[PDB]
Amino acid sequence: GTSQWLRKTVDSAAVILFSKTTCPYCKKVKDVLAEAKIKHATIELDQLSNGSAIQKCLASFSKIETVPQMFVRGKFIGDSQTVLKYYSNDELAGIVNESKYDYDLIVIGGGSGGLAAGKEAAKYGAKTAVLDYVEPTPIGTTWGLGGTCVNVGCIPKKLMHQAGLLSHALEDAEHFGWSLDRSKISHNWSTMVEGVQSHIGSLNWGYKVALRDNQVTYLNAKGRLISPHEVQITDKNQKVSTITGNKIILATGERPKYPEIPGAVEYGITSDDLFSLPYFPGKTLVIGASYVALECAGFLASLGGDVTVMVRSILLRGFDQQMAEKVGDYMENHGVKFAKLCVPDEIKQLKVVDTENNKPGLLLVKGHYTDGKKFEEEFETVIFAVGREPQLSKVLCETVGVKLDKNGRVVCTDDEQTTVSNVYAIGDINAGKPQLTPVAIQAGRYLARRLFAGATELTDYSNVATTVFTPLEYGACGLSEEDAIEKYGDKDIEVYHSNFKPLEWTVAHREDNVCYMKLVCRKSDNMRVLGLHVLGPNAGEITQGYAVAIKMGATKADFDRTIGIHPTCSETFTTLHVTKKSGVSPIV
Amino acid sequence: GTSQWLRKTVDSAAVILFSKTTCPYCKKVKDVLAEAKIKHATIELDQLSNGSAIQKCLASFSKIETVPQMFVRGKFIGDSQTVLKYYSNDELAGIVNESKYDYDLIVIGGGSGGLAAGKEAAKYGAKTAVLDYVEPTPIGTTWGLGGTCVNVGCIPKKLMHQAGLLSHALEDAEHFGWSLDRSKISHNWSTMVEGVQSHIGSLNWGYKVALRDNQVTYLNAKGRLISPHEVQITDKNQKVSTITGNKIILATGERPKYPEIPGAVEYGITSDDLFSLPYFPGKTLVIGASYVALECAGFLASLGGDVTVMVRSILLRGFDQQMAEKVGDYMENHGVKFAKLCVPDEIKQLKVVDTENNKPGLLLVKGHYTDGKKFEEEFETVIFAVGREPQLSKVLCETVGVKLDKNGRVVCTDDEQTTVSNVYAIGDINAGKPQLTPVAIQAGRYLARRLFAGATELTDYSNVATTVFTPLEYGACGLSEEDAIEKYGDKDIEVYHSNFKPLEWTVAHREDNVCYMKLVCRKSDNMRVLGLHVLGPNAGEITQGYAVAIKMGATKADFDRTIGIHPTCSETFTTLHVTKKSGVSPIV
Numbered sequence A, B: 001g002t003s004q005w006l007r008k009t010v011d012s013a014a015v016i017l018f019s020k021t022t023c024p025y026c027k028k029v030k031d032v033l034a035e036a037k038i039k040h041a042t043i044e045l046d047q048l049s050n051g052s053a054i055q056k057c058l059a060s061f062s063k064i065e066t067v068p069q070m071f072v073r074g075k076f077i078g079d080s081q082t083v084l085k086y087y088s089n090d091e092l093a094g095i096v097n098e099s100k101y102d103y104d105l106i107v108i109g110g111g112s113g114g115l116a117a118g119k120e121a122a123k124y125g126a127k128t129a130v131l132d133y134v135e136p137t138p139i140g141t142t143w144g145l146g147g148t149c150v151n152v153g154c155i156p157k158k159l160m161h162q163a164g165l166l167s168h169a170l171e172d173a174e175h176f177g178w179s180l181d182r183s184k185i186s187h188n189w190s191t192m193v194e195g196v197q198s199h200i201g202s203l204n205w206g207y208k209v210a211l212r213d214n215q216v217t218y219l220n221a222k223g224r225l226i227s228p229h230e231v232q233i234t235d236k237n238q239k240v241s242t243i244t245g246n247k248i249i250l251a252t253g254e255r256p257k258y259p260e261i262p263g264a265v266e267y268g269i270t271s272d273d274l275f276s277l278p279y280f281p282g283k284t285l286v287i288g289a290s291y292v293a294l295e296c297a298g299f300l301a302s303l304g305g306d307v308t309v310m311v312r313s314i315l316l317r318g319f320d321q322q323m324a325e326k327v328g329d330y331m332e333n334h335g336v337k338f339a340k341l342c343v344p345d346e347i348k349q350l351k352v353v354d355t356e357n358n359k360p361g362l363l364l365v366k367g368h369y370t371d372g373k374k375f376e377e378e379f380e381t382v383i384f385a386v387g388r389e390p391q392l393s394k395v396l397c398e399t400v401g402v403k404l405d406k407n408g409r410v411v412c413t414d415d416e417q418t419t420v421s422n423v424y425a426i427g428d429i430n431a432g433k434p435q436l437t438p439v440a441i442q443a444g445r446y447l448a449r450r451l452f453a454g455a456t457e458l459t460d461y462s463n464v465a466t467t468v469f470t471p472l473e474y475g476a477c478g479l480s481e482e483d484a485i486e487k488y489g490d491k492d493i494e495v496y497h498s499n500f501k502p503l504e505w506t507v508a509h510r511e512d513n514v515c516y517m518k519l520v521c522r523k524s525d526n527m528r529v530l531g532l533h534v535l536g537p538n539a540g541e542i543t544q545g546y547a548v549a550i551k552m553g554a555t556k557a558d559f560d561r562t563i564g565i566h567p568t569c570s571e572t573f574t575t576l577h578v579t580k581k582s583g584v585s586p587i588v
């Protein structure tokens, strides 16, 4: 147990010191390494329960049982007198840089997970390279370091959402006494895009500085794993070379899918193109029904656009379907049109994009409903949001032996290890895990600590909370109502629910019973909270704190004994009492 | 023991049915009572682990041991055969209405706690009266049913806070691309006040309708307890009479204090007057430094006022003082002036309030600083926020025997009982308790269930979360850093902290490092979270859910293993890592 841990730790750490907090000899070695600018991990044996047994086990490698003991890439280097000898003779720098491979770690992909992993590993002395390359979209769009969320996902999406929310704030301001007239105010798309892209630019630059300041090598090059330790890289000038690494982390993410119909690639766009588009989309069709589809349609309508969403079957497949339908109903009452049970057949071009006057083109969209009736309408912009996929055939030679599942994602054990022992995978390409930025960041950081600092903590992927940033936001943590009933049976499930009205909505004359929350609980397990759901403003701020209590096993009684904060929306969770089985109305 | 619970339950309940969920004689008695419109409590002995011992205990009163046992006001009424015979002879209604007193419960005070307690008691067949009267302020202000929070507290205060927040939304909107010019937009105070007051009006009306629909007798009359069971009432027409009640709940709340200086009562106002004031206060002095003082100064500055705050010693006494100083620093950078270490000596009138044309007057304020220097400046409005106090002298005859503390608050045991066994106190007049609206509501509801439905659960007053609605909001749950250090010692306390920047503030060009959060933890108890603190937007929404986790005993490890929701402010709590002891800067 302890002896297997110590061997794994010694073999994979780049530079590591076994120490005690009280030892002045350990203190002296720490000071030497700090002066020499030699980064390393440290294990403090006195603060571990099995510290005495670990100290015994070290002799299997060093033949000594005292602290300090310093190791480099699996090799015992010395105790205090020996380390000082090397430093005094100007030998220590060469010893700590001796390596079989070019790098201790190569990260393929410079996004949410990969940048987090590479920075954390470098902290413990791992010589690290991060590779990032952005394949242009069909119309030619590209962007800088930081991945999907930074450039074409979470960050610009929520900033445009905030511009859309301010439309309603301008309306509400009249009722609260301000002299403006929302009727005479309009939105300038390109001014908003300039501001969003300026912030994104500062993040691109900030990641480059952070890698520079952590001594991480950044290569703006496309990588391909051609054997367990060899990565072939192609740089900006199409120069091809090979670099080697001890450990490999795959973190290459996904890109939007297109339907296989005429005109889709030529004349439509995806979210990759939307967030830097130089002109307002105009009259827009969004094809699809994921959270990406509904978030983008939502803010486009708030910013004054004529928006239609064409839905093949249901909204937000995979989420609680009562909540999904409430989300869609709010959007439809606030200016989004839906073409339900409908798919596209072809896109025909009526007008080329006008670069001269900074204006969209014009497209004819033909499709059909499930009963066979036809769909035909003109739109200035068509946005495809029909899912995302990895393309690991490009990243990864078949002969390496890394196992992929039926959707092309990497099959990993619960420590992110692939079927090849030195290769790991994190983020969206890890099969079966929630595809979210804070999941990729936690996975990458925790993995770096296990590989290079002897940590044992794994990432917990269960009950990860989400928020959908539609015009009225939807936060969730845990099971949908229908999954809970499927797993445990209707008899063992009790659901508490209520409508509510934000206080800010009263003087503004907004709707009385649209916002909604519910707790899905298991009767036979002390009324354990299985899932939490809320539709209302600031839904992500509301939901986050409860994710801790659910992780700790909160029951309905834990919610009841907690006192609310007044006046808030979130406090309504502390006093819920109407059950669905009672048939009593949830309106207030 | 079981037998003392039963004897207390029987003696106290108005109408109560001892039952089992699987007995058809029980079910038949319930249907008769339902049909007769007879409300009652029900105890299902089969769902209680000590049910069989209760049945033997029942024979004390009834000399039977079987289920169906009906009691009315301490007296056994009958089993199934007796109850059904009374009903078919039209004798049952008279039996269940028989009472020694006018009411089972008299609530003195119709505010947050008192309305809650009275409605809940009525659900179990307690014949209930709620008394409410609003003594006018010195200038004559009065209002309707619902108490301090509804009419002159949390509700109008947060609505005027929202009007202030919207001024910054109007500024932000230009940066997000909207065509308005905030420079050319102004605020109309009277439009605001008219909308706030029309909402409060709908709440006064809703409380009257709610009492009628629960068969609660509402008396708009001043009450005075003159003996344990007699309440003297007076009467919009000054008619004095006496009504009697079995149980009494005191819920009369507090009112603002005035300093004992010339001109204060004549020429200053309080929060009681501010929320319906028909003229804009203009150049305003706020005297005091409580959360009421700072909240009101904050929104008045945001709505265009020239505002000064006069501070005797410190800001937000009783709150974490690091956090209090950050709250005030933001306020000072956004147009609130502070006269620190300063106290008033007299208010002189220079011009009378123009009630005709809705203009304030003019006042000369004279004061002095602690060094000795003089204060003298003109203001159009002077607002006193120097604390709140009860006036139980008016409510409670000294001869009844209800003990008060040195501040005039009621001394209660942990079940809200006073030194007189049938008299209880809830809300702000209960000595030692947090003075918050959801605390009053939970105390009131839970107490009514113990008196009239045999419940045993007590209100938990520990770790009750708060939010101060200053222009940048401050949420907290648990201990301040300085109380934790005083209670456990500096060596046993670890503090994790970080600045943050809301994503909404990036494109709007707001401050990088003013929002702030921290977790105060106890090392020797598994890094238990003792206190949580956040300064930023939507702080009450952020804080609420974490209050459940802290009640369940969250540790730092529970926060670390939980995954964040991105992009939010609240997610910063899930990745905190900089300790105060390390000395590393908390900036982003």
Ligand SMILES: Cc1cc2nc3c(=O)[nH]c(=O)nc-3n(C[C@H](O)[C@H](O)[C@H](O)COP(=O)(O)OP(=O)(O)OC[C@H]3O[C@@H](n4cnc5c(N)ncnc54)[C@H](O)[C@@H]3O)c2cc1C
Binding pocket: A108, A109, A110, A111, A112, A113, A114, A131, A132, A133, A134, A135, A146, A147, A148, A149, A150, A152, A153, A154, A155, A157, A221, A222, A223, A224, A251, A252, A253, A254, A271, A292, A394, A395, A426, A427, A428, A429, A435, A436, A437, A438, A440, B565, B566, B567
């Ligand atoms: C529109 C949209 C909105 C979203 N909103 C949210 C939200 O609100 N909250 C949330 O939590 N998540 C959100 N997400 C999801 C989030 O963006 C992803 O879960 C996250 O970015 C995944 O990170 P990753 O590290 O796995 O991959 P990525 O961030 O996609 O990083 C992979 C990087 O590697 C590069 N790369 C690919 N192949 C190679 C190669 N061969 N060599 C070198 N580099 C290569 C890619 O170009 C990219 O830069 C959103 C996603 C989208 C599309």
Ligand SMILES: Cc1cc2nc3c(=O)[nH]c(=O)nc-3n(C[C@H](O)[C@H](O)[C@H](O)COP(=O)(O)OP(=O)(O)OC[C@H]3O[C@@H](n4cnc5c(N)ncnc54)[C@H](O)[C@@H]3O)c2cc1C
Binding pocket: A565, A566, A567, B108, B109, B110, B111, B112, B113, B114, B131, B132, B133, B134, B135, B146, B147, B148, B149, B150, B152, B153, B154, B155, B157, B221, B222, B223, B224, B251, B252, B253, B254, B271, B292, B394, B395, B426, B427, B428, B429, B435, B436, B437, B438, B440
């Ligand atoms: C400016 C301000 C802002 C506040 N903001 C918040 C906030 O954001 N959040 C929060 O949780 N709390 C807030 N509070 C506190 C909250 O208002 C109180 O905790 C709550 O109102 C107390 O309820 P209560 O039932 O104890 O008394 P009250 O609500 O004051 O009700 C007592 C009632 O009894 C009446 N009465 C008095 N004497 C008699 C008599 N003899 N006969 C009949 N009736 C009588 C009173 O006039 C009143 O109607 C705020 C308070 C103030 C002043």
Ligand SMILES: CCCn1nnnc1NC(=O)c1cccs1
Binding pocket: B028, B031, B032, B035, B084, B087, B088
């Ligand atoms: C055998 C006695 C019948 N009886 N006598 N008085 N009332 C009732 N029944 C009822 O009130 C009802 C029970 C179920 C539906 S109505």
